[PDB]
Write an enzyme that holds these catalytic residues in place. Structure first.
Site, PDB file in Angstrom:
ATOM      1  CG  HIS A  18      -1.929   3.677   8.283  1.00  0.00           C
ATOM      2  ND1 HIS A  18      -1.568   2.566   8.879  1.00  0.00           N
ATOM      3  CD2 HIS A  18      -0.860   4.096   7.526  1.00  0.00           C
ATOM      4  CE1 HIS A  18      -0.352   2.250   8.525  1.00  0.00           C
ATOM      5  NE2 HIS A  18       0.060   3.180   7.715  1.00  0.00           N
ATOM      6  CG  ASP A  46      -3.735   0.547  10.427  1.00  0.00           C
ATOM      7  OD1 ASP A  46      -4.352   1.245   9.633  1.00  0.00           O
ATOM      8  OD2 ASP A  46      -2.509   0.475  10.444  1.00  0.00           O
ATOM      9  N   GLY A  81       6.817   2.906   4.589  1.00  0.00           N
ATOM     10  CA  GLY A  81       6.779   2.170   3.327  1.00  0.00           C
ATOM     11  C   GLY A  81       6.347   0.708   3.485  1.00  0.00           C
ATOM     12  CB  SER A 115       1.933   0.910   6.327  1.00  0.00           C
ATOM     13  OG  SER A 115       2.485   1.663   7.411  1.00  0.00           O
ATOM     14  N   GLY A 116       0.744  -2.101   5.844  1.00  0.00           N
ATOM     15  CA  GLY A 116      -0.159  -2.932   5.044  1.00  0.00           C
ATOM     16  C   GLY A 116       0.375  -4.294   4.745  1.00  0.00           C
TER      17      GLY A 116
HETATM   18  N1  LIG Z   1       8.044   1.522  13.176  1.00  0.00           N
HETATM   19  C1  LIG Z   1       7.267   0.709  12.478  1.00  0.00           C
HETATM   20  N2  LIG Z   1       7.161  -0.581  12.880  1.00  0.00           N
HETATM   21  C2  LIG Z   1       6.546   1.214  11.388  1.00  0.00           C
HETATM   22  C3  LIG Z   1       5.832   0.290  10.584  1.00  0.00           C
HETATM   23  C4  LIG Z   1       5.069   0.774   9.522  1.00  0.00           C
HETATM   24  C5  LIG Z   1       5.061   2.151   9.322  1.00  0.00           C
HETATM   25  N3  LIG Z   1       4.373   2.773   8.394  1.00  0.00           N
HETATM   26  C6  LIG Z   1       4.697   4.053   8.652  1.00  0.00           C
HETATM   27  C7  LIG Z   1       4.074   5.080   7.899  1.00  0.00           C
HETATM   28  N4  LIG Z   1       4.296   6.392   7.996  1.00  0.00           N
HETATM   29  N5  LIG Z   1       3.394   7.072   7.092  1.00  0.00           N
HETATM   30  C8  LIG Z   1       2.708   6.090   6.493  1.00  0.00           C
HETATM   31  C9  LIG Z   1       1.785   6.257   5.434  1.00  0.00           C
HETATM   32  C10 LIG Z   1       1.769   5.348   4.372  1.00  0.00           C
HETATM   33  C11 LIG Z   1       0.866   5.538   3.329  1.00  0.00           C
HETATM   34  C12 LIG Z   1      -0.010   6.612   3.346  1.00  0.00           C
HETATM   35  C13 LIG Z   1       0.010   7.518   4.410  1.00  0.00           C
HETATM   36  C14 LIG Z   1       0.916   7.347   5.476  1.00  0.00           C
HETATM   37  C15 LIG Z   1       3.106   4.819   6.937  1.00  0.00           C
HETATM   38  O1  LIG Z   1       2.714   3.546   6.570  1.00  0.00           O
HETATM   39  N6  LIG Z   1       5.534   4.302   9.677  1.00  0.00           N
HETATM   40  C16 LIG Z   1       5.758   3.048  10.092  1.00  0.00           C
HETATM   41  C17 LIG Z   1       6.538   2.599  11.163  1.00  0.00           C
END
Ligand SMILES: N=C(N)c1ccc2[nH]c(-c3n[nH]c(-c4ccccc4)c3O)nc2c1
Lengths: 151, 254, 96
Positions: free
Chosen positions: B41, B90, B190, B192-193
């Site tokens: 994503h 993902d 921030g 993610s990945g």
């Molecule tokens: N509550 C969590 N455990 C969580 C973990 C990773 C997340 N990553 C994100 C996220 N919100 N938007 C994006 C994103 C990152 C890069 C490009 C586009 C969207 C994200 O990776 N919300 C998140 C919430």
């Protein structure tokens, strides 16, 4: 597969056996036990029993709170999984041996260095016995169980 | 990372930071000198594909010490089953344009065998999750790498414990939950990945990818991670293949 | 067996009567209500990874075998792995 239900700890002098239902029709079970922060350990692998001795695990630290779960698998297909790609299971009640094990000097199942430790070794100069003022062991700080049977 | 600690420099050597045009995009995990696993994503909105960079040996985003190594990401491979804007499947496999050099500060995380991951690693209670993301939901992203020890859950328990209404998709077999439902600790935007890494008998393995959650540390909710065991086969097959051209490749899954 | 007088504790265990129930005190290599399960017979991969440090493979009618990740080789004891390389995956050099 049907999930187990009625998960129950039967424990006397720390000899602890989990029991559950149903009697399996073309199905087997495995149990996992852990403390709240510890890893899960498997036991009674693919049994058709509806009980699992867990004494060996719980006497390692009788003051921990253990949680156990029982998985149900198609006998034959021990690699069965529901939609979440995980095997069906059901959790037990929590069990803290030191505070919930039924009382029956008397050796308990708690071993230290393979020898068994007795009631007084596990409950210290803090275990008391009723006479009238017939003996009954009592652990008066307990919430549950507290008094033994009579002698 | 909400409620974690600063990962001491070098104690998270597989951590990757992806940047698009110098701006932080997502975290990633180094599985060998040219391959990085991140989340699909993260690439939903990529337009400047040449401008995607991976940094290894990074720790403090404000001060460059000698240890950082930057490589252009030559290719981004995502499952043919991932639908842009959703959270299922993902996982993204990134080919670096030239290998990084392994050093005390740049070391790959072992991609475990599937059966080992499923029958052994899935039952190690705590694993570490990490990144430079927000330290509170809608709060400031961090400057030094943060790491958080989270307990994992089987999906029955995750679904039993979670409250319904909020942005929460289905927890599929391609996902698992880990974290805390009391509002204290979770991964966040921030992150993610990035890696969910499990320790087992002296070595660390990749068991999940930071993926999504309802907010970050929302009470009655847990963080959701890509269950990497479902993709080991797909990963290894891809890493052995002849480079297709194209920056983004949707490779067949299974 | 049934309650103590009917020798319920298998494999050398000692029975101990309770209110019609009993408790079997087992020998170190056994467990179960009746000391029936031999601890030594469960060397399978679902069981504490078969004692293997890294990978485990069960085999039909023969002992399981332990294996290792690329960059590692199986040691003499048939269970441990040792890095054969400089920077083996999953190891943190400043803590090694
Ligand atoms: N509550 C969590 N455990 C969580 C973990 C990773 C997340 N990553 C994100 C996220 N919100 N938007 C994006 C994103 C990152 C890069 C490009 C586009 C969207 C994200 O990776 N919300 C998140 C919430």
């Amino acid at each position: 597969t049907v999930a187990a239900y009625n998960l129950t700890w039967k424990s006397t002098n720390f000899k602890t056996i989990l029991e559950w239902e149903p009697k399996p029709v073309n199905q087997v079970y495995t149990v996992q036990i852990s403390t709240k922060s510890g890893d899960w350990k498997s036991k009674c692998f693919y049994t058709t029993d509806t009980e699992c001795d867990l004494t060996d695990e719980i006497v390692k630290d009788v003051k921990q709170t253990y949680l156990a779960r029982v998985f149900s698998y198609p006998a034959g297909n021990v690699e069965s999984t529901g939609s979440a790609g995980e095997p069906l299971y059901e959790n037990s009640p929590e069990f803290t041996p030191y505070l919930e094990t039924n009382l029956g000097d008397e050796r308990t199942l708690v071993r230290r260095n393979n020898t068994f430790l007795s009631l007084r070794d596990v409950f210290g100069k803090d275990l008391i016995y009723t006479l009238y003022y017939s003996v009954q062991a009592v652990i008066p700080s307990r919430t549950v169980n507290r008094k033994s049977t009579d002698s | 990372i909400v409620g974690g600690k600063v990962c001491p420099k070098g104690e998270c050597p597989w951590q990757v930071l992806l940047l698009v045009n110098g701006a932080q995009l997502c975290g990633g995990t180094l599985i060998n000198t040219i391959w990085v696993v991140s989340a699909a994503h993260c690439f939903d909105k990529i337009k400047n594909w040449r401008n995607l960079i991976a940094v290894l040996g990074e720790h403090d985003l404000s001060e460059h010490d000698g240890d950082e190594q930057s490589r252009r990401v030559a290719q981004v491979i995502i499952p043919s089953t991932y639908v842009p804007g959703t959270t299922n499947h993902d996982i993204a496999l990134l080919r670096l344009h030239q290998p990084v050099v392994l050093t005390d500060h740049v070391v790959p995380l072992c991609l475990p065998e599937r059966t080992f991951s499923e029958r052994t690693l899935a039952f190690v209670r705590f694993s570490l999750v990490s990144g430079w993301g927000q330290l509170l939901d809608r709060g400031a992203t961090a400057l030094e790498l943060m790491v958080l020890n989270v307990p994992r859950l089987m999906t029955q328990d995750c679904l039993q414990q979670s409250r319904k209404v909020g942005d929460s998709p289905n927890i599929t077999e391609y996902m698992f939950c880990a974290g805390y439902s009391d509002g204290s600790k979770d991964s966040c935007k921030g992150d993610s990945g990035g890696p969910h890494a499990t320790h087992y008998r002296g070595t660390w393995y990749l068991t999940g990818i930071v993926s999504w959650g309802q907010g970050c540390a929302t009470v009655g909710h847990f963080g959701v991670y890509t269950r990497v065991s479902q993709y080991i086969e797909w990963l290894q097959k891809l890493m052995r293949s002849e480079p297709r051209p194209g920056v983004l490749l949707r490779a067949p899954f299974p | 067996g049934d309650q103590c007088a009917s020798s319920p504790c298998q494999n050398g265990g000692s029975c101990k009567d309770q209110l019609q129930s009993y408790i079997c005190f087992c020998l170190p290599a056994f467990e179960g209500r009746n000391c029936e399960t031999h601890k030594d017979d469960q060397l399978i991969c679902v069981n504490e990874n078969g004692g293997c440090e890294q990978y485990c493979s069960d085999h039909t009618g023969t002992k399981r075998s332990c294996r290792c990740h690329e960059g590692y080789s199986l040691l003499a004891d048939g269970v441990s792995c040792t890095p054969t390389v400089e920077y083996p995956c999953g190891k943190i050099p400043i803590l090694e």
